[PDB]
Design a protein around this nucleic acid. Structure first.
Length: 91
DNA sequence: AATAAGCGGAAGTGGG
DNA sequence: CCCACTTCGCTTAT
């Protein structure tokens, strides 16, 4: 199956769900979620995984926080803003 | 109080 | 048993 960071990057690269997520600085890999439309994006994540329960942004963001040590996706100090690693962007 | 964003421990569940 | 997520209490700022 597809990893969450790759699902998010795929969305960004295709301009699907443009109301839900967008680049802030695409060269740096900084991207941002919509306050009001993030739940439809998380909902789509959960379906794509076939999960038992419905996926919510909180649980998606819980998953994102695990990337913080290994580094694929880091939280930026702005509202709803994260950043892909350079390694993630090069692939 | 209310609310949205943000955090991390911990047990559960996947993985041709 | 780790991967790679998946499913409260706490905390801060408005």
């Amino acid at each position: 199956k597809i990893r969450l960071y790759q699902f998010l990057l795929d969305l960004l690269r295709s301009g699907d769900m443009k109301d839900s997520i967008w680049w802030v600085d695409k060269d740096k890999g900084t991207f941002q979620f919509s306050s009001k439309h993030k739940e439809a994006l998380a909902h789509r994540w959960g379906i794509q995984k076939g999960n038992r329960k419905k996926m919510t942004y909180q649980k998606m963001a819980r998953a994102l926080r695990n990337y913080g040590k290994t580094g694929e996706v880091k939280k930026v100090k702005k509202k709803l803003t994260y950043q892909f690693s350079g390694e993630v962007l090069g692939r």
